[PDB]
Write a protein that binds this ligand. Sequence first.
Ligand code: HEM
Ligand code: HEM
Ligand code: HEM
Ligand SMILES: [Zn+2]
Ligand SMILES: [Zn+2]
Ligand SMILES: [Zn+2]
Ligand SMILES: [Zn+2]
Ligand SMILES: [Zn+2]
Ligand SMILES: [Zn+2]
Ligand SMILES: [Zn+2]
Ligand SMILES: [Zn+2]
Ligand SMILES: [Zn+2]
Ligand SMILES: [Zn+2]
Ligand SMILES: [Zn+2]
Ligand SMILES: [Zn+2]
Ligand SMILES: [Zn+2]
Ligand SMILES: [Zn+2]
Lengths: 156, 156, 156, 156, 156, 156, 156
Amino acid sequence: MKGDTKVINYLNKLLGNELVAINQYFLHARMFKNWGLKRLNDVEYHESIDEMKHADRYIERILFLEGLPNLQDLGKLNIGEDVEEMLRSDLALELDGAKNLREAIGYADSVHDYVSRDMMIEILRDEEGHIDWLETELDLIQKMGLQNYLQAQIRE
Amino acid sequence: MKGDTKVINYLNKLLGNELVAINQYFLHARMFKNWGLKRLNDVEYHESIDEMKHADRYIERILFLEGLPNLQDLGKLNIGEDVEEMLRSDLALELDGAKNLREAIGYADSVHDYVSRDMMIEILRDEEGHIDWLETELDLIQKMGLQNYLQAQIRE
Amino acid sequence: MKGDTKVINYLNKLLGNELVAINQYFLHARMFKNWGLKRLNDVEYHESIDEMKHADRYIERILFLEGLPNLQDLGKLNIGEDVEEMLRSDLALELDGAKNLREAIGYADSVHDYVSRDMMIEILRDEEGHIDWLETELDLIQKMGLQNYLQAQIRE
Amino acid sequence: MKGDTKVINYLNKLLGNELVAINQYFLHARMFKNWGLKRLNDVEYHESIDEMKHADRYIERILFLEGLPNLQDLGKLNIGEDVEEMLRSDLALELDGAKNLREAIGYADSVHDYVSRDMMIEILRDEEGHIDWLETELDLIQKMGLQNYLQAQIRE
Amino acid sequence: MKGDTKVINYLNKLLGNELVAINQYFLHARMFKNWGLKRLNDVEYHESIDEMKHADRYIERILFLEGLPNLQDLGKLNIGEDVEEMLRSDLALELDGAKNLREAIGYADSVHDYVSRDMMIEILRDEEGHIDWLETELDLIQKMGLQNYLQAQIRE
Amino acid sequence: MKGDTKVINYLNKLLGNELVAINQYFLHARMFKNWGLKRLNDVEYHESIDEMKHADRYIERILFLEGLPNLQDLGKLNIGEDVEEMLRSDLALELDGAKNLREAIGYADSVHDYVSRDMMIEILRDEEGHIDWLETELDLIQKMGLQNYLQAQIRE
Amino acid sequence: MKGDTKVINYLNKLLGNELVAINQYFLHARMFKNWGLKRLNDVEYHESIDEMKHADRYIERILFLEGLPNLQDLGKLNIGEDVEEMLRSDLALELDGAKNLREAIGYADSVHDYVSRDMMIEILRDEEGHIDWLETELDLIQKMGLQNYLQAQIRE
Ligand code: HEM
Ligand code: HEM
Ligand code: HEM
Ligand SMILES: [Zn+2]
Ligand SMILES: [Zn+2]
Ligand SMILES: [Zn+2]
Ligand SMILES: [Zn+2]
Ligand SMILES: [Zn+2]
Ligand SMILES: [Zn+2]
Ligand SMILES: [Zn+2]
Ligand SMILES: [Zn+2]
Ligand SMILES: [Zn+2]
Ligand SMILES: [Zn+2]
Ligand SMILES: [Zn+2]
Ligand SMILES: [Zn+2]
Ligand SMILES: [Zn+2]
Ligand SMILES: [Zn+2]
């Protein structure tokens, strides 16, 4: 089915977002794992998989709409060197992708691509979930302090 | 069976207490849950259910005694903004309801409504239980300090 | 995540609707139960739980959007004294809440809060279900007459 | 253990009440059964057993308190000739026994026989239950009319 | 295998009958379902499936006899607005299709298409069954009156 | 619940689309089955059922919105005489129904019938799926040629 | 443990290779899936996962050797527009990565990083496997011709 060109661009753009998220989350996961923060590796790893499912959904959609998925361009990774810095980076990224999702969803609706819209809304719901988690951890770090927070990540 | 009017008023009054408790506990639960204090959400949620069972018991009793359960009037909620403040509020409330229960129980006995009395005593036993729990948490917060207490609520 | 203020007000308003529904349905349930209309107690009770799940959804959402859930204000309960009157009251209430849901959903979409919107649409679908049921019972009462309808509620 | 004499008299008196209830309920049960009102035979039969458990409790208590259980004197049975009349009789009887229970309970407390009291309160709770049931059936008969009520008792 | 042309026309004609029956029965089913007459929705729905199996049988037969099944032409639906009217319509339709089946069966035999005949006879046996059911319900409505009949359809 | 009239017309129109799809797909299925293309009969048959579930959804919705489902009018079937021609016909039909779904969805949203909208979106997602399948088969026929394609349908 | 700097560069370089392979294989997989070549989607998808396991191994190794895994730089994807072209591209890529692996393995041995070496050898064994598969498919396409090859990918 020939899709709307601008919807495809959006889908590619969003795809692009998930592909930076996928890498940044996986690196973070294995950084935490290395440091022995087993619990943070577990969650961020599972978030990496999450972003991958998203990427796949865009890819299959672009192909269905007869567009060319762009996995060539990779946006800026921002890794960070300590837990806070790195959580905070993941959150800024999820925040930028939500902004992009909000725009794309609106546009899909206005060109009547309701199923792309529908898939985008479910994705944003997942993103909003990741946002929740990042915010919560970042706040726990302040309430209980960094040392206690770190100890709390040692077991899975 | 026509019940004693004043017993019905008491039962309504007590019902009224449980219905503020139900809401305050549920809000607290989901506040804790949002903050990531999984353990406190678990307990306060289960206390919300507890107060609901109580409310139901009064409702069925008032109806049996041929009175009109009043679910219209809702007493003052006091929510609080941090764990201590909020635990402390739940405790003041349980304390006021116990006082009311003590009064009502005495009166039921003196008009010979022994089964209302019996149901009230079992309820107060549950309340006293909630009082125990609130007091214990509040004391743990002092003994181990707030940061360690918070870390201790992260897992269920 | 800071939500849109007016979306939060809507969410609180809707929350407020569910909290009257929760009480009115529960009272009705136990009123029917008392009268021995076992079947009506079963359904309205299960509708009470239904409205509670809704309330919870709003609460967790308002908290996520960083607003303050208001469980303090309770709208007007209208109880009624016989089956019809009471069914008819539940229906007027579901009807007012659907109207509010329709208004809120539109607004969520226009400020791009697509996930609040999404949760609201699923809720309205449930409400519309309750509307169906109330309408159906009210019509059965006319087609088969009140006496036969009452007999039909004696067993679960 | 030598019990208080007046407590024993009360226990005997109450025993006496259960033994009329036992017979009246059983006769009613088998009257309903004969008429084909299977459902009413089921409940009243189970109430007969209920009263028997009560009788047993008094008997074992009187014997423990070193009194002589009197199963010789049997109060006035009032049978009735149709469903209503007969339900209405069972209800007047439960009502008289509740009155007696209330008096006895008060007295047990004042001579410090707290366990007799305790057993009496549990019994009265059961009685109050039977009262509920009789009242409910009697009201169903008015709401739905006698013919529909009778049809509703044909299956168990 | 080249079939007899007139047999194919008959098969198409009969097919045509089943395709009105299929729709009329399904609409009726969901009309009853909507009204809360759960029991009538269950049966008419299962009759819709029944007619579909019939249609399929004709279709596969026409194709085997090398004819073109006509699913394009749809006879007159007669829906009705109340239970009786609608049952009575389903019955007139089954009656017309039985008449057509009787004619077709005779003709198949006389051109030696014994297997088409055989399949038609089994179908007519099913139809005759549906006729039985419709007649019986229509008579129950008179014997027990409409109100009692309606109550009797509330549970499945 | 009284629905918006134009929404009902749309729902009827869409219903009408599914009812041509149901027949065309079933005929195609049994045409393939007859030709021994077991694999195509399996899929198109399962698509026929799919369209039937859709029809049912519209029917129950129209009835809920207090409209009259029209199963009387049947649009133009286009059958075709060979695999390609017939696949190509099914695709043109799915394409016209998607167009209609897109218009109806927009309109539902603008009159606030969000649940009709919601059901329509899920349907369109299924349709879009059928579109995918038809397009894919049509392209396989070109890539691998007709003879190889036919052989590939012989087993299920 | 501080690793040898040049070993880390190699590990990063190789990592870089797996991350182009991961994307190219996944796109290919879903391209085949879209075209209905179910069998090729299955294998290339499983090769994508394979390359991901590899990437993970490098990442955990670089982190253990105290280096910074570079997931930022992404080499040139070469996608292709038909099966052959695309298989042929995957093969050229596996061939370049094997060359790099051979170089790195030698160097690891000469600086005594025998475990990095060991992990690299196991990886190359997997790569050599993928090479085998690509070569085999490419040859089957010539022996049996493109049409027959395509038909052979339709089922999993
Ligand atoms: C380039 C950095 C990546 C790394 C290090 C990585 C790592 C992993 C790992 C370790 C797994 C678990 C293997 C398993 O399923 O058992 C996995 C699963 C998966 N990956 Fe990736 N991945 C990456 C990128 C991608 C990309 C770009 C895609 C394509 C959208 C993708 C798609 C998938 C899918 C669909 C699964 C299966 C999920 C499941 O069912 O568990 N990955 N990945
Ligand atoms: C208005 C604020 C309330 C909220 C947010 C709330 C929430 C909940 C939730 C989430 C559940 C679990 C659902 C389940 O049973 O699986 C529940 C259960 C229940 N609620 Fe409420 N509730 C509220 C008020 C009430 C009231 C006023 C009553 C009536 C006395 C009530 C009676 C019950 C009962 C009987 C259960 C079943 C307990 C069980 O067996 O688990 N609730 N409530
Ligand atoms: C007129 C041509 C039709 C034919 C030849 C046909 C054929 C069939 C067949 C063979 C089945 C399988 C029976 C089973 O469920 O075991 C079926 C199922 C079904 N049909 Fe039809 N059908 C037709 C039209 C319709 C229509 C107009 C509706 C109403 C919307 C409908 C609704 C259904 C439903 C709800 C099922 C059950 C699906 C399931 O759970 O498997 N059909 N049909
Ligand atoms: Zn994502
Ligand atoms: Zn995310
Ligand atoms: Zn309580
Ligand atoms: Zn309490
Ligand atoms: Zn609700
Ligand atoms: Zn509702
Ligand atoms: Zn007794
Ligand atoms: Zn009794
Ligand atoms: Zn038939
Ligand atoms: Zn029939
Ligand atoms: Zn459809
Ligand atoms: Zn379709
Ligand atoms: Zn590799
Ligand atoms: Zn490889």
